[PDB]
């Protein structure tokens, strides 16, 4: 009972909703970042379990991917890490387009 | 026309096929890794933002409790080659939250067309 | 108003570190005891930036594990937190040793750490 | 083979020199970057690092920090020294580049990541 379906909030104030998880682990949702337009997300959970998803920013040329795992101790918490890819015009600048960080979500 | 649809290979010998990209940027595919149970085709799911647009996708390993996410951009250069420059995160499964610090690996991959 | 790295620090996972004086050129030395084979004090070596009239400078250091074939590097900034406290916000890389170049792809781990004064 | 001392070049055109490695694995050096993405005035910058010295029968891992002389940033690199499929000596590294932010609220966006392959000059 650490199911991803429902509403989540993070340490920076951002929100996300995740809908039902189908028999093959897939799910859909929305993400609202606190630092802003709803943007759709798409992902998968392995069949406690680990999971990944992609967020296609509706207001920026970027993409973010998240991966993580759901825990209990219980309070439920998703521990994630992400990559944020910026758009560059030339291949010469590719070296500077990827940022990395973390995020901890708890239920809303 | 640096379009993701088709077949790709990487620096480590892995393959992937990506199907058509719908009006909302979404796509589906398969990934066969040359390196590590034993290895199997695994499905992938992702999205492209909407000439050299950025993209992301998740791979759900059919043979392991892990998950990998890839993000990148499609370029043309240097010699005229189409190339996807990616970075990925590979998340392993842990039993306790105390070991979470140790569960994420990071690297890169360059794909060219097959 | 400034944020000096000299002294003793603890983190979110229970680990400790001591950092000695910072010389005129930003260099420093220290020791690292990780809370997470048997664990031992390990030396660290690093630098802090000294560019503009800057009171929260960035910095980096390397830890040479005395009990493992690995290496970790940390990089961050020193803040005066909202609460008057001093805090180091860091990210790290942990590199394992592999025997062949073919396995290099799987040798690097990444995470974070927040340190506060002891 | 595979001793870090000497001169190196990378895939982006940058250079670095590393001096002698003492008994405790420490070393010093210099880094000249070919790319700034800033208002240049690019300059030699000093580096400091360490190489591991447990079980000397394969190639050891190492880390170092670069203190940019022209920018408020810092980069750290970590990696291992190999002999490659082609007979070359090669350092495979990954790095983190930390930018300076003014408030703690913007910390989440201050770290970039990538890779670099060095071969001897
Ligand atoms: C998250 O939800 C709260 C209400 O539950 C809302 O006020 C907040 O603005 C949301 N976060 C963002 C960034 O929209
Ligand atoms: C990928 O496809 C290429 C050519 O079609 C082949 O050489 C290679 O063996 C395939 N690799 C895997 C891991 O499926
Ligand atoms: C770090 O210092 C603390 C002081 O709170 C002490 O309890 C502990 O012995 C030290 N940590 C480790 C892991 O040795
Ligand atoms: C690196 O060194 C070579 C010769 O030793 C020099 O020609 C080259 O310009 C250097 N790279 C940079 C970007 O300064």
CB contact under 8 A, D113 and A99: yes
Which ranges in chain D belong to alpha helices (H)? none
Measured from the CB, is residue A12 less than 6 Å from ligand 1?
A: no
CB contact under 8 A, C112 and A102: yes
Best of A49, A85, A95 to disrupt the B interface by mutation (most B CBs within 10 Å)?
A85
Q: Which residues of B are annotated as a binding site?
A: 31
Q: CA of C23: how far to CAs of A2, B5, C19, C20, C48, in Å?
A: 50, 56, 12, 9, 10
Pick from A15, A38, A105 the residue to mutate for probing ligand 1's pocket: most ligand atoms within 8 Å of its CB.
A15
Phi, psi of B100 (to 5 degrees): -55, -35
Long-range contact set of residues D17-25: C-beta below 8 Å, sequence gap at least 24 = D18/D47, D21/D51, D24/C43, D24/D53, D25/C64, D25/D50, D25/D51, D25/D52, D25/D53
Long-range contact set of residues D37-43: C-beta below 8 Å, sequence gap at least 24 = D37/A93, D37/A96, D38/D70, D38/D71, D40/D70, D41/D70, D42/D70, D43/D69, D43/D70
| Ordered domains of chain D (ranges, CATH) | 1-121 (2.40.128.30)
From CA D103, how far away is CA D107, in angstroms rounded? Answer: 7
b/e for D47-69, b at 16 or more Cβ within 10 A?
bbbbbbeeeeeebbbbbbbbbbe
Residue A1 marked in a binding site: no
Helix (H) or strand (E) holding D93: strand D89-98
Query: Which residue among A12, A92, A100 places its CB closest to the CB of D113?
Result: A100
Pick from D10, D32, D36, D70 the residue to mutate for probing ligand 4's pocket: most ligand atoms within 8 Å of its CB.
D32
Closest CA to B66 of B94, B92, B87, B88: B92
Helix (H) or strand (E) holding A32: strand A26-32
Q: Are B11 and D85 in contact (CB under 8 A)?
A: no
Q: What residues in D contact C26, CB-CB < 8 Å?
A: 67
From CA D35, how far away is CA B5, in angstroms rounded? Answer: 33
Say which experimental method was used: X-ray
A41: Cα within 13 Å, side-chain hemisphere = 26
CB contact under 8 A, B106 and D94: yes
Closest ligand 4 atom to the C-alpha of D14? 13
Q: Are C109 and B106 in contact (CB under 8 A)?
A: yes
- State the resolution, in angstroms: 2.5
| Contact residues of A toward D, CB < 8 A | 12, 35, 83-84, 92-93, 95-96, 98-101
Q: Which token pair is C88?
A: 């180091």
Q: What residues in A contact C111, CB-CB < 8 Å?
A: 81, 102
Long-range contact set of residues B89-92: C-beta below 8 Å, sequence gap at least 24 = B89/A65, B89/A67, B89/A81, B89/A82, B89/A83, B89/C110, B90/A67, B90/B66, B90/C106, B91/A50, B91/A52, B91/A67, B91/A68, B91/A69, B91/A81, B91/B66, B91/B67, B92/A50, B92/B65, B92/B66
Phi, psi of A93 (to 5 degrees): -100, 5
Measured from the CB, is residue A32 less than 6 Å from ligand 1?
A: yes
Best of A100, A102, A103, A104 to disrupt the D interface by mutation (most D CBs within 10 Å)?
A100
Closest ligand 4 atom to the C-alpha of D7? 5
DSSP secondary-structure letter at C101? G
From CA A55, how far away is CA C31, in angstroms rounded? Answer: 41
From CA C109, how far away is CA B107, in angstroms rounded? Answer: 9
CB contact under 8 A, B73 and A48: no
| End-to-end Cα, chain B, rounded Å | 16
Q: What residues in A contact B88, CB-CB < 8 Å?
A: 83
Q: Which token pair is C35?
A: 């809370």
Q: CA of C31: how far to CAs of A72, C101, C118, in Å?
A: 34, 31, 14
Q: Tell me the CA–centroid distance for residue B32 and ligand 2, in Å.
A: 8
């Amino acid at each position: 009972k650490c199911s991803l379906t429902g509403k989540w909030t993070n340490d920076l104030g951002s929100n996300m909703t995740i809908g039902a998880v189908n028999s093959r682990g897939e799910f859909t949702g929305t993400y609202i970042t606190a630092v802003i337009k709803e943007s759709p997300l798409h992902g998968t959970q392995n069949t406690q379990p680990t999971f990944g998803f992609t967020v296609n920013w509706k207001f920026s040329e970027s993409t973010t991917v998240f991966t993580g795992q759901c825990f209990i101790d219980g309070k439920e918490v998703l521990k994630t890490m992400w990559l944020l890819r910026s758009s560059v015009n030339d291949i010469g600048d590719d070296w500077k387009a990827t940022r990395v960080g973390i995020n901890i979500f708890t239920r809303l």
